[PDB]
Scaffold this active site. Structure first.
Site, PDB file in Angstrom:
ATOM      1  N   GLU A   1       0.817  -1.195   0.000  1.00  0.00           N
ATOM      2  CA  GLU A   1       0.000   0.000   0.000  1.00  0.00           C
ATOM      3  C   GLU A   1       0.863   1.262   0.000  1.00  0.00           C
ATOM      4  OE1 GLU A   1      -2.631  -0.093   3.333  1.00  0.00           O
ATOM      5  OE2 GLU A   1      -3.647  -1.958   2.712  1.00  0.00           O
TER       6      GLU A   1
ATOM      7  N   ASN B   1       2.069  -5.400  -2.890  1.00  0.00           N
ATOM      8  CA  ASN B   1       0.646  -5.596  -2.562  1.00  0.00           C
ATOM      9  C   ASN B   1      -0.059  -4.258  -2.368  1.00  0.00           C
ATOM     10  OD1 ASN B   1      -1.238  -7.900  -1.847  1.00  0.00           O
ATOM     11  ND2 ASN B   1      -1.451  -6.678   0.050  1.00  0.00           N
TER      12      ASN B   1
ATOM     13  N   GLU C   1      -6.414 -10.630  -0.792  1.00  0.00           N
ATOM     14  CA  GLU C   1      -7.263 -10.338   0.362  1.00  0.00           C
ATOM     15  C   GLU C   1      -8.732 -10.222   0.023  1.00  0.00           C
ATOM     16  OE1 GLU C   1      -5.830  -6.968   2.446  1.00  0.00           O
ATOM     17  OE2 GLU C   1      -3.705  -7.589   2.363  1.00  0.00           O
TER      18      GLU C   1
END
Length: 302
Positions: free
Chosen positions: A128, A170, A236
Site C-alpha cells: 500500500e 501488494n 485479500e
C-alpha cells in the site's frame, strides 16, 4: 478433489487460501473449516512490523510462528504479510525518519525473512505504497519521505535475505484497469522489470465494495501485469454482500490468466472478517456454506 476450494484450485495448479488469526485457533469450528478448505494461509496480523519487531532490534515470533506452524502442520503454504508498510508500525518506528528509518526498514526485512528463510511461498515486501487522491503517485509516509527508491531498496534487500521467496508488491484499489492508482503501480512494476529490480509478484488485495466495485476489466489488469513478467495474486479477497456472480467472476478472472497463482479470501467466516457487517466471505457465522461458496467451487471445478 473437487470437494473443497484448495483441492479444486490445485486442479489447475493454483491455491485457494485464507487469512488466519492466531486468536481464533482455539475455536474448533473455525479450524475444522479452515483446515479443510484452504491450502494457503496468510497471518492476518501476526507478521506485521508491530507484531514482529515491537521493540527495536528485539523480534517476537510467537504469534507468527503459531500461525505458521498451524498452517504447515495442516498441509498449507504460507504468504508473509508484511515487511514494509506505512501502517502497523510500532511507536519507535513511527518516530523515525530519513536514513535511520531506512536502516530500520532494511533491518526489519533482514530479521523477519531471516527467521522464516525458505519457508515462505510469497512475501508482501511492500504494502500500500500508492495514494488514493487520484494522482497515481506515491502515498506520503515516513517511508516515502526517506526517498523514492525505498520500495526498490526494500525489494533488493528481501531478494538477498531470502532468495527462495516470491517477492510481491501488494495494494488495494489497483484492480480496475482505468484507475490512476492501477496505472501508477503498473508504471512502477514496468520500470522495475525493465531495470531488473527483483519483483516476482503483484498482489491485488481485491477488497470489493460500493466504493471499489468489481469491474470485469479486472481481467485486463491481471493480463497486463502478467505480461510484464510477474506473477499475480488475489491476496485479500472479500466482496461486500457476497454476490455469487461477483465471486464467480473474480474466480474466473484468475483462471483465465495463467500467471495468476491463486486466490486468498480475507478470513474464514463472515463473523471473522474485518467487515463482518457486510458479510463478505464464503461461510456464515455458523459455519454453513454461502451461495458464493458454491459459485466459487463450481468455477474452480469449471
Amino acid at each position: 478433489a473437487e470437494s473443497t476450494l484448495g483441492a479444486a484450485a490445485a486442479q489447475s495448479g493454483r491455491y485457494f487460501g485464507t487469512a488466519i488469526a492466531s486468536g481464533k485457533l482455539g475455536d474448533s469450528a473455525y479450524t475444522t473449516i479452515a483446515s479443510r478448505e484452504f491450502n494457503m494461509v496468510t497471518a492476518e496480523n501476526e507478521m506485521k512490523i508491530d507484531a514482529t519487531e515491537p521493540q527495536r532490534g528485539q523480534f517476537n515470533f510467537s504469534a507468527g510462528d503459531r500461525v505458521y506452524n498451524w498452517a504447515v502442520q495442516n498441509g498449507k503454504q504460507v504468504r508473509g504479510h508484511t515487511l514494509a508498510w506505512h501502517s502497523a508500525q510500532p511507536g519507535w518506528m513511527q518516530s523515525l525518519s530519513g536514513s535511520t528509518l531506512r536502516q530500520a526498514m532494511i533491518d526489519h526485512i533482514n530479521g523477519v525473512m531471516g527467521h522464516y528463510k525458505g519457508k515462505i511461498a510469497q512475501w508482501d515486501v511492500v504494502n500500500e505504497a500508492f495514494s488514493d487522491d487520484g494522482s497515481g503517485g506515491r502515498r506520503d509516509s515516513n517511508l516515502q519521505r526517506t526517498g523514492n527508491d525505498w520500495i526498490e531498496v526494500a525489494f533488493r534487500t528481501a531478494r538477498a535475505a531470502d532468495p527462495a521467496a516470491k517477492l510481491c508488491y501488494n495494494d488495494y484499489n489497483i484492480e480496475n484497469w482505468t484507475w490512476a492508482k492501477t496505472q501508477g503501480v503498473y508504471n512502477m512494476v514496468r520500470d522495475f522489470k525493465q531495470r531488473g529490480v527483483p519483483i516476482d509478484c503483484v498482489g491485488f488485495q481485491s477488497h470489493f465494495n460500493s466504493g471499489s466495485p468489481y469491474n470485469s476489466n479486472f481481467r485486463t489488469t491481471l493480463q497486463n501485469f502478467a505480461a510484464l513478467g510477474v506473477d499475480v495474486a488475489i491476496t485479500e479477497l472479500d466482496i461486500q454482500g457476497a454476490s455469487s456472480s461477483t465471486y464467480a467472476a473474480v474466480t474466473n478472472d484468475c483462471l483465465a490468466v495463467s500467471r495468476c497463482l491463486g486466490i486468498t479470501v480475507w478470513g474464514v467466516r463472515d463473523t471473522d472478517s474485518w467487515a463482518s457487517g457486510d458479510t463478505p466471505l464464503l461461510f456464515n457465522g455458523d459455519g454453513s456454506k454461502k451461495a458464493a461458496y458454491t459459485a466459487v467451487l463450481n468455477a474452480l471445478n469449471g
